[PDB]
Amino acid sequence: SKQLFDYLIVIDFESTCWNDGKHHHSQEIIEFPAVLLNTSTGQIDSEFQAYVQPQEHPILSEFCMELTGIKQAQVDEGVPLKICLSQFCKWIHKIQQQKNIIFATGISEPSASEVKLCAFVTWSDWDLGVCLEYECKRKQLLKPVFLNSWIDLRATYKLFYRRKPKGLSGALQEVGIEFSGREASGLDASRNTALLAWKMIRDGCVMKITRSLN
Amino acid sequence: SKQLFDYLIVIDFESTCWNDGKHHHSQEIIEFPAVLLNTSTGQIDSEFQAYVQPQEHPILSEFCMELTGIKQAQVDEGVPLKICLSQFCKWIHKIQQQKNIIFATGISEPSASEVKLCAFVTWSDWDLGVCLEYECKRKQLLKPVFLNSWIDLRATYKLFYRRKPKGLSGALQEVGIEFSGREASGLDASRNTALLAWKMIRDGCVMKITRSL
């Protein structure tokens, strides 16, 4: 099976959250992880991780610290989301200059092996379609335009293996990949999502864009 | 004090929820309540209630059934969300045929004629700005355009009384309205939210649109 993208960037956001019934607050990203997956070798050639300091609700709840495993001192040393997006773009620009990566849906010219097509992968459409999207609009921040299209890996998992998975853990378990300890979060969840994408590629799944916000 | 809107429609959604240690992002509406408040008389002239059958997670968790008071058989008898908006629009169309209500944007003056201005009121922006909005966008359903602007009663309470309320119950307690027992849910919570809005009108608060999409 021939893949369209030479690299995927897998992202699994962690954010503030509460489950106190009908009290509803505004959620802010607290961890911004990304792993660069090589669709030809299967390895992780580069990683990005930044803890984001919340501004509207800077105190992490016990439910949130229990769910994400993130301690208070980590978001206290972290940077606001605005600075985080600048750091992430610097990382994107770095991996472009190193691996000759562009973000395109296809080359309308004969293929040149020097250029590499890359795409963003998330588990659900929640990361780049809900979490980062509706937070940038509410804080009037500039969202990088290359995060407006991605690959919903859960939807890709459903139509490929022809079954409905019960979360990222359930999907990994059904294909024989079992991890130990608590459910991964942040950079660990991103690495495991990239493992699932690599397993799907080995099984012959061609990763295609599933959602666009344009 | 002269009010801008002649009627308010108060909405307090109930939705699926879990507390099983896992990450949960998409919630589905399971109760669709709405009360029509008369801002001049103080009465509730009409009500709407529909139990919505969830599709992505049709089995209500025990944490959800306990928190909302909704039993599994009620959403089993309920209708999908798509059908629910059609019933809600028929109810909107019905109160239009009876009370001559219109929904208009950028209203800088109370109506002085036969036509009556109405607006939607919810506690916080979560109901019409997060819950219904994301669920319609992910399910590719057509959301009624008149649900694109509303009155955040929590924000209106904060800037009017100049104090931080501890939830809808905390807000009611601070204005002398005290309830006992479990936290209300669904249609009961909508009536209690409309009670708060009526008292705020009595204190002189002019209800204004706070959010528009």
Swiss-Prot record, chain B:
Binding site for Mg(2+) 2: D12, D127
Keywords linked to the UniProt accession: Exonuclease, Hydrolase, Magnesium, Metal-binding, Nuclease, Zinc, Zinc-finger
Coiled-coil ranges per UniProt: none
Residues annotated as binding Mg(2+) 1: D12, E14, A189
All residue ranges annotated as the Exonuclease domain in the record: 8-197
Superkingdom: Eukaryota
Active site per database record: E14, A184
A GO term, aspect molecular function: 3'-5'-RNA exonuclease activity
Binding site for AMP: E14, A184
Disulfide bonds: none
The family this protein is said to belong to: Belongs to the ERI2 family.
Name this protein carries in UniProt: ERI1 exoribonuclease 2
Included range, full protein: 30 to 242 of 691
